[PDB]
């Protein structure tokens, strides 16, 4: 199903510091709905800047304690059939 693919980078150097996937949402896209990200042309098609608004909407699905004053965050909406 759909996993949120979360990725983050050092604001100072741009070095990669971490990646985390949410659990699988199956075929329920409403998390995308709550981000305000239309489905069209957005699933398996790139990463979005995690804005301040998005943090509260996203944090419930991640171990990583998202800190946008420390790091740049990006999420993509990966979809693969089944368990993956």
């Amino acid at each position: 199903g759909l996993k949120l693919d979360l990725t983050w980078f050092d604001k100072s150097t741009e070095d990669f510091k971490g990646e985390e996937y949410s659990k699988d949402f199956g075929d329920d896209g409403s998390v995308m709905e709550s981000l305000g990200v239309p489905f069209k042309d957005n699933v398996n098609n790139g990463c979005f800047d995690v804005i301040a608004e998005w943090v509260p909407l996203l944090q419930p699905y991640f171990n990583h304690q998202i800190d946008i004053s420390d790091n740049e965050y990006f999420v993509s909406f990966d979809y693969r059939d089944g368990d993956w």
Partner: protein
Amino acid sequence: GFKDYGHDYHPAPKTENIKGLGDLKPGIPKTPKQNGGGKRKRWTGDKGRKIYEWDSQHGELEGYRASDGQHLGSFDPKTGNQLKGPDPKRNIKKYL
């Protein structure tokens, strides 16, 4: 409906499954598409001298020379084999 949207494009490879291009690290994504709000997933290899970007319509990695963005061709993520060769017309110099 939503599964349908999920088969519009080819899922990108997860980093650990990209074989044959050395150790790779995700890079900050910066290349827009015209349709879609997303930036293309990006990885660096070879101490950052090489950049790869997932192309989700063709389903292959496009490789670029980090110093000037020049296109190097595409690669199969499973093997790391060159599939297309360089195209002199193509670069990512504005997205580095």
